[PDB]
Structure formats: structure tokens, C-alpha cells
Amino acid sequence: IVEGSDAEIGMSPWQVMLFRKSPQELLCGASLISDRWVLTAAHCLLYPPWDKNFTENDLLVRIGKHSRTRYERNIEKISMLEKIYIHPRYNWRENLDRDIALMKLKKPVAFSDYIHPVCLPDRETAASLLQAGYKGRVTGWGNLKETGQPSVLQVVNLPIVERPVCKDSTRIRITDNMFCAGYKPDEGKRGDACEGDSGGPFVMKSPFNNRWYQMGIVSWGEGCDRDGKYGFYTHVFRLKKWIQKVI
Amino acid sequence: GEPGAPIDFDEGGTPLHEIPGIRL
Amino acid sequence: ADCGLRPLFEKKSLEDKTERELLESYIDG
Numbered sequence A: 001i002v003e004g005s006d007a008e009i010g011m012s013p014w015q016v017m018l019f020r021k022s023p024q025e026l027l028c029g030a031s032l033i034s035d036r037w038v039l040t041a042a043h044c045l046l047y048p049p050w051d052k053n054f055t056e057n058d059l060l061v062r063i064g065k066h067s068r069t070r071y072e073r074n075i076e077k078i079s080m081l082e083k084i085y086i087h088p089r090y091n092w093r094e095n096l097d098r099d100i101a102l103m104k105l106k107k108p109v110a111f112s113d114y115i116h117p118v119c120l121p122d123r124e125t126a127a128s129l130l131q132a133g134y135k136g137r138v139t140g141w142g143n144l145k146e147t148g149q150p151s152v153l154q155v156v157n158l159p160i161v162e163r164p165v166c167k168d169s170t171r172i173r174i175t176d177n178m179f180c181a182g183y184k185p186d187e188g189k190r191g192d193a194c195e196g197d198s199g200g201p202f203v204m205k206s207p208f209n210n211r212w213y214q215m216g217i218v219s220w221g222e223g224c225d226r227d228g229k230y231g232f233y234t235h236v237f238r239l240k241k242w243i244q245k246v247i
Numbered sequence B: 001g002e003p004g005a006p007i008d009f010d011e012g013g014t015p016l017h018e019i020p021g022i023r024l
Numbered sequence C: 001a002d003c004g005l006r007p008l009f010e011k012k013s014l015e016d017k018t019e020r021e022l023l024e025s026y027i028d029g
């Protein structure tokens, strides 16, 4: 996260760390959506153009965490993956269309003060919150500057951007399965996800029922926190039918 | 006020990896 | 059923340091 701040303890209890067993390193973010299901981006697990192809036994999930590196005993919970489900029409060849994956934990995780699932949006929620200029929240342990990791989980709040503005900031072909977020050069504030934050949640707090909803998945961007560029997020609601038949 | 993404369900171009500084 | 309500915030009627910024962006003006 660029231009963010430390998260508070318990601020993002759905945040999941996808940790590479060997070599020991942060692979991606993810989110907890049930006691046994974790949501992430498909390209965190599968990206042939960079020879990336991770199976269940390559990865560990670490849930409840705050420190990027310290074992948090009686706070964090480690888990192993039963099965990985990548969207059948995930387009790794071009633009990362349908950048979504689900992961089943080998055993369900007990919830706690630090571990708690995020909601997925309904149609009513998606319609009320997915409006240009409304701010979501992005969290992760990714890099603080373009291409230098934080001590603890970082947080930044970012506005959803009008679709024609998103499409005009990039040469990439943008699909209805993506939205973009970020401040514009003349907005005074800044902030972005960066390397390491991929697959984490873009969440919004409903003013109607006080609950946090995962509206997006950290998918891709051009640089980190560049003027005139914006982060692109998987449009979670539009893919809910696929999320459905997996569980 | 303006929708940032459509509320229906899911039913060429340059590849991301060719963009300089691409963040994945 | 309990999703998205945080034990250390919503369940204790405590706001985090910046969730007001989010709510404030949802109002049009």
C-alpha cells in the first residue's frame, strides 16, 4: 500500500495473507468469506506469462495477522488449502478478465476478535455503494513505494472512478468485470495498492446495516500511485454466480 | 451518483505483461 | 449471518480511525 497508514488492531479481520512456503515470502493478499473459504485473485495463483503456477501444497494461509513478519501467537491462525478453484474463463492471456479464485481450507478456522468473515454484496448493496466517488478501503502488506515492505498491515481509502475515466487512463481493454479506484491528479489526496497487495479486498461499509462488504479484489495497475493512473479491481458482485456454484 | 460498475451478472487487446511498470 | 461486523469495532459500537471518511464520501451534497 502506497500513501496509506498502519491498520488498527482488528480493523480488517477478514484479511488473509497468502504466504509462499519456499522461498519464504508474501505472495498475495486474500480475504476470509466463511469459516472454510478464502477469496483471492486468480493471477496470484496462475499467471503463465511470468511462469507462475501455484498448487495447494505450495501455499500457506495466515489469518488474523497484523505484523508482516512476527509470529503472532494465540492471535494468528495458520491453515492449509484443501482445493483451489480458478474461474474457468479467467483471461490470463490478455487483461486479467475475471481475476478471481476461491480456496478451501483443509479445516475450518475458528473466528475470534482478529478473525471474522467479510460479507459479499447483494444486488441492493452493489447498486447503492458502487457509485463513482464513493470510497472503498484497500488493505495489504505490499510494498510502500513503486517497485521496502511495511512492518504491519497497511490501509488506504480510495474513491471509485467513473468508467470512461478508467478506460481512458490505460491502453488495456477494460471489461464489465473490472472497476477502477483512486484519486485524480487534482484531488490533493493520493494512495494505491502495490506489489504484494494483489488479491486482497476492496471493501465498503454499508451505511444501511453497518456491515463491511467486499466489493472488489486487488487485481492490477500501472506502477503504484502514479498521477493519471488508477488501480483496477475485480467486480466481485458480477462474478457471484460462479462464487455460488463453487460453494 | 454515477454507477462505477454494472449490476448484471457475468455471461483483442494488449497483454498486461507488455506494459512497462505493470503492477501485478 | 454475522459477516462484516468486526468484534473490535461494530460489535463494541466503536468506530475505527477513518471509517468516517468512507461514510462521508457516500453522501452526495
Ligand SMILES: *[C@@H]1O[C@H](CO)[C@@H](O)[C@H](O)[C@H]1NC(C)=O
Pocket (backbone or CB within 6 Å): A048, A053, A055
Ligand atoms: C499449471 O498447472 C499445473 C501445475 O502442476 C501444470 O502441470 C500445468 O502444466 C500448468 N498449466 C498452465 C496453463 O500453466
Ligand code: NA
Pocket (backbone or CB within 6 Å): A182, A183, A192, A225, A226, A227, A228, A229, A230
Ligand atoms: Na493515481
